[PDB]
């Protein structure tokens, strides 16, 4: 049952280096070819190089071929990626692949980790909870949210009692002004539902360690 | 390096219909044509390999063609789920390199914006800011306009604005939007409203609140 699993992400200050690993389970990792990618924010993805089995042939894009070194252990099960020199443009999701046998094609990508090159502070986020006034409703459901400010770097996890309650939420995509983010969720449940059913925002900012729960509480007829 | 030329670089169609993405390569690349699948918030995953063959539990409804320099791919009847950006890549030679995508987006039919709207939380005005929040959710199509206004003047500094990508289970869209203002400014003025514009009505969608009435 394949598996990969990126980390080491996280912020690195322009110039710096920053050693990303992939975990591999469920295939006989030595027998396969693997690979590098990277996704910026708003671009295509990107090949950043592969390995063979015995790490003798090592290829990379030539943009990086002087920043990156790939290399892997294959009696840990574990693929690297050394970045050093970083720029704003390594800014991105970066994923590890694995090349199905016998051919030049990534048949199983990883889930990626977020690397930001960037020289703003880290800062934790204010977490703020919505909800109507004056009885707004819409039919016979209402709509609360969770505002989430003034943080630095991506990425914030937002959830609903835990993750329970997923259905009829919309969590925005982040976005970035003068180097803090601001991120928001809504979350619609039947008017019978809350608050007699209570409803939780869980906020998670690993980069700050902050984590935050903030019960939504009427501040108008139910 | 080998340059994949992709197009269309966006598409727009309704499901059940057939659809083709091309790719050309700067130079020949024998069959060496591979051609991935990312939706929203996962990973990209193989669809087709040596240009027009099924990876393993790849669904009929894919294929691809070509030889040399020209290739395309095809989805013979379009899903709701099939929502994603497709790319291809060559795998010739170093570097293997990709095309630059095309995002597949579904037609479904006209649904108007559920607005709500939200005053500062209490919290937030604690620490001397404040934030007028309006989410505008399972809407299309997704051109939608939105306009602040306090005590009936437009208000555009200080606005920052979130779109979803469109939901592949109901094909709509949402946006939020955000007004931020100091506490002191906030409490110069009593009306606050989002208007939302959207094809669905001649009319806009407003929501306000007033600081002290209700
Ligand atoms: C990302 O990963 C990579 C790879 O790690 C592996 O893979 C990952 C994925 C993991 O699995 C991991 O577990 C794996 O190991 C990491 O790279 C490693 O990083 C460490 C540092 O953190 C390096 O360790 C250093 O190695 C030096 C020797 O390196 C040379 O030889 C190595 C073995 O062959 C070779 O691998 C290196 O590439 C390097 O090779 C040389 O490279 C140069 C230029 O590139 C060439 O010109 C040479 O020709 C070439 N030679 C050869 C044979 O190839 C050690 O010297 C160094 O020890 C010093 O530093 C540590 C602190 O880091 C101290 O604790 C030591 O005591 C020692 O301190 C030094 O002490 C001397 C005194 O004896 C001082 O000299 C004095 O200095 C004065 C001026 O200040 C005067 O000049 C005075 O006269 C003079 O005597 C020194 O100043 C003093 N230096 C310092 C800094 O304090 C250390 O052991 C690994 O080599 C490196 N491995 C690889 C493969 O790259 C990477 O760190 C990681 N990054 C991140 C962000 O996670
Ligand atoms: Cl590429």
């Known amino acids: 049952n394949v598996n990969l699993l990126e980390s080491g992400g996280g912020l690195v200050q322009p110039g710096g280096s920053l050693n990303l690993s992939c975990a591999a389970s469920?295939?006989?990792?030595?027998?396969?070819?693997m690979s590098w990618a990277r996704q910026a924010p708003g671009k295509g993805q990107e090949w950043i190089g592969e390995i063979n089995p015995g790490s003798s042939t090592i290829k990379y894009t030539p943009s990086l071929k002087d920043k990156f070194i790939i290399s892997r252990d294959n009696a840990k099960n574990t693929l690297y990626l050394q970045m050093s020199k970083v720029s704003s443009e390594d800014t991105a999701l970066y994923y590890c692949?694995?090349?199905?046998?016998?051919?030049?094609?990534?048949?199983?990508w990883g889930p990626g980790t977020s690397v930001t090159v960037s020289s703003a502070k880290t800062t934790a986020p204010s977490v703020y909870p919505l909800a109507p006034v004056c009885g707004d409703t819409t039919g016979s459901s209402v709509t609360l949210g969770c505002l989430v400010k003034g943080y630095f770097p991506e990425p914030v996890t937002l959830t609903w009692n835990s993750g329970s309650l997923s259905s009829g939420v919309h969590t925005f995509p982040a976005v970035l002004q003068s180097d803090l983010y601001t991120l928001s969720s809504s979350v619609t449940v039947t008017s019978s539902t809350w608050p007699s059913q209570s409803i939780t925002c869980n906020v998670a900012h690993p980069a700050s360690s902050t984590k935050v729960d903030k019960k939504i509480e009427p501040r108008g007829p139910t | 390096s080998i340059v994949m030329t992709q197009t269309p670089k966006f598409l727009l169609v309704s499901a059940g219909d057939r659809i083709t993405i091309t790719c050309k390569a700067s130079?020949?690349?024998?069959?060496?044509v591979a051609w991935y699948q990312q939706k929203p918030g996962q990973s990209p995953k193989l669809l087709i390999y040596?240009?027009?063959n099924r990876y393993t539990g790849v669904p009929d409804r894919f294929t691809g063609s070509g030889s040399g320099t020209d290739f395309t791919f095809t989805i013979s009847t379009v899903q709701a789920e099939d929502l994603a950006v497709y790319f291809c890549?060559?795998?010739?030679?170093?570097?293997?390199?990709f095309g630059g995508g095309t995002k597949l987006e579904i037609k479904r039919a006209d649904a108007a914006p559920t607005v709500s709207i939200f005053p500062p939380s209490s919290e937030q005005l604690t620490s001397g800011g404040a934030s007028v929040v309006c989410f505008l959710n399972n809407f299309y199509p997704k051109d939608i306009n939105v306009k602040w206004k306090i005590d009936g003047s437009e208000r555009q500094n200080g606005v920052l604005n979130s779109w979803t990508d469109q939901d592949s289970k109901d094909s709509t869209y949402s946006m939020s939007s955000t007004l931020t203002l100091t506490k002191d400014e906030y409490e110069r003025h009593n009306s606050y409203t989002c208007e939302a514009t959207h094809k669905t009505s001649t009319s806009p969608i407003v929501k306000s609140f007033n600081r002290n009435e209700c």
């Open positions: 040596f240009a027009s």
């Open positions: 692949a694995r090349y199905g046998s016998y051919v030049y094609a990534m048949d199983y």
């Open positions: 469920g295939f006989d990792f030595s027998r396969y070819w």
């Open positions: 130079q020949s690349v024998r069959n060496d």
């Open positions: 890549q060559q795998g010739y030679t170093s570097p293997r390199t």
